[PDB]
Amino acid sequence: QDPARSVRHIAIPAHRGLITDRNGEPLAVSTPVTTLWANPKELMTAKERWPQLAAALGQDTKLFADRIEQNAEREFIYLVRGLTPEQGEGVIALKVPGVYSIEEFRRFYPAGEVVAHAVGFTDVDDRGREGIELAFDEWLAGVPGKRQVLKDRRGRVIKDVQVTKNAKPGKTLALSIDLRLQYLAHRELRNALLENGAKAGSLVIMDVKTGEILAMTNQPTYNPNNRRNLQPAAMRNRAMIDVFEPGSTVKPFSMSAALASGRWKPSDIVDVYPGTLQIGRYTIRDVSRNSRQLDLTGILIKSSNVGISKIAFDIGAESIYSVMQQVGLGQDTGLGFPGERVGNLPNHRKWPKAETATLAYGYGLSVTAIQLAHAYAALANDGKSVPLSMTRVDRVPDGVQVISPEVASTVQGMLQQVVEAQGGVFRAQVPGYHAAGKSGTAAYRSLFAGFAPATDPRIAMVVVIDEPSKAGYFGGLVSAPVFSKVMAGALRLMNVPPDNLPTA
């Protein structure tokens, strides 16, 4: 016979660590629940109790009975996982022979859909599946304990023996996300999609000095507390997973290389007439073709592919590739989110003219919205690229000085003109502040990337609107007004003073 007594092991689930926003607002909270297990050998002695037990478990009478009967020779099965503690005590109070309980936890997400992708969610086993819950799973999960119970020959629990290993609680995590800014970004991106009839979109806000991600929202979104019917489209963390060719939004990096070469200054003029440039078989074409001479700021205002290409041929692709690589376009962010996409930054030993030109005006490389925002953050932070963080930064790390402060300041002023000057991106203007930025077109994505205050930058932001299909309230670039609204609120939520003084 089997021994009259045996010492069996039961895991002790650990309490998963609290996730908060940067201000301590709870974002993911472990909630006590009760799991019930049973010894079928004992249940088989108390069959008249089964229907009441099945009812208390929310299970069908006959499906429940079938399950016990088919497991009659086992000494352990789960009856139900994750009942409320109240529902649990109700089941336990039936006093059915062979019914036992385990204290576990399940997550609740107080901000729900507002921060769905960034926070992510746990699986049925309380394990991180998406977002920060996934990226920091080991930190948040801790380590289960193990305890021993004395059982008899038929698996009846006689008593607790001891705990052999205590559970190590999961550890707390404060995100860089500011829920105040995340709500503003979530609301405005949702409104922009509705008014533009768009498929999807993303918005990222970064602190340019600290590398912190202050907001990251995508549409569609979902309620992580109720995923019954959640469609895969909604679950996608587009800001980190969708790659696209950034188009004219990378011209400022080409310009930074031009100004660093020693060969170009902002007042220089390039003749871009007639809005095309033939290089062998290939023709470089501007979208708008109403220009002849443009200064360097003009090339940006007009999104002149021709103009930036002539500059690129003069300075060489290598110098542009170097800046783009160093600011992180097509490069690992270091954020450690499994499944994050890196995109691609093409390299060559001998750069063909077509590849040089297209790199310079943003085709042939592919990036994510996070990378684009980090790149603009370096430009905004006087050329210093601080590593990205999704967690609160108290001690600011050194950044790599990727662009000289002087070149960065010059480009900031050019991008301020892109927003402010006649012919520029009118609806990107941020009332009460000077803002700086650049539009582009990634079945298209509308892109806007920028920062503010333009003369002393604090915040960088990228807006991506995927496949707009309906006319919005304002004309012009679809993503521009979203930048305007979100930047206006974010700057004020952060108490950033206006930089548009009357000449002081």
From Swiss-Prot:
Domain of life: Bacteria
GO biological process: cell wall organization; division septum assembly; FtsZ-dependent cytokinesis; peptidoglycan biosynthetic process; proteolysis; regulation of cell shape
Location in or out of the cell: Cell inner membrane
Chief location category: membrane
Active site (record annotation): S248
CC terms in the record's Gene Ontology section: plasma membrane
One Pfam family linked to the record: PBP_dimer
Keyword DNA repair set for record: no
Pathway it works in: Cell wall biogenesis; peptidoglycan biosynthesis
Keywords: Carboxypeptidase, Cell cycle, Cell division, Cell inner membrane, Cell membrane, Cell shape, Cell wall biogenesis/degradation, Hydrolase, Membrane, Peptidoglycan synthesis, Protease, Septation, Transmembrane, Transmembrane helix
GO molecular-function term, one example from the UniProt record: penicillin binding
The enzyme's E.C. designation: 3.4.16.4
Topology versus the membrane: Single-pass membrane protein
Regulation: induction: Mainly produced during exponential phase of growth.
Catalysed reaction, written as an equation: Preferential cleavage: (Ac)2-L-Lys-D-Ala-|-D-Ala. Also transpeptidation of peptidyl-alanyl moieties that are N-acyl substituents of D-alanine
Family of this protein: Belongs to the transpeptidase family. FtsI subfamily.
UniProt function note: Catalyzes cross-linking of the peptidoglycan cell wall at the division septum. Binds penicillin.
PANTHER family for the chain: PEPTIDOGLYCAN D,D-TRANSPEPTIDASE (PTHR30627), PEPTIDOGLYCAN D,D-TRANSPEPTIDASE FTSI (PTHR30627:SF1)
Protein name: Peptidoglycan D,D-transpeptidase FtsI
Organism whose genome encodes this protein: Pseudomonas aeruginosa (strain ATCC 15692 / DSM 22644 / CIP 104116 / JCM 14847 / LMG 12228 / 1C / PRS 101 / PAO1)
Gene that this sequence comes from: ftsI
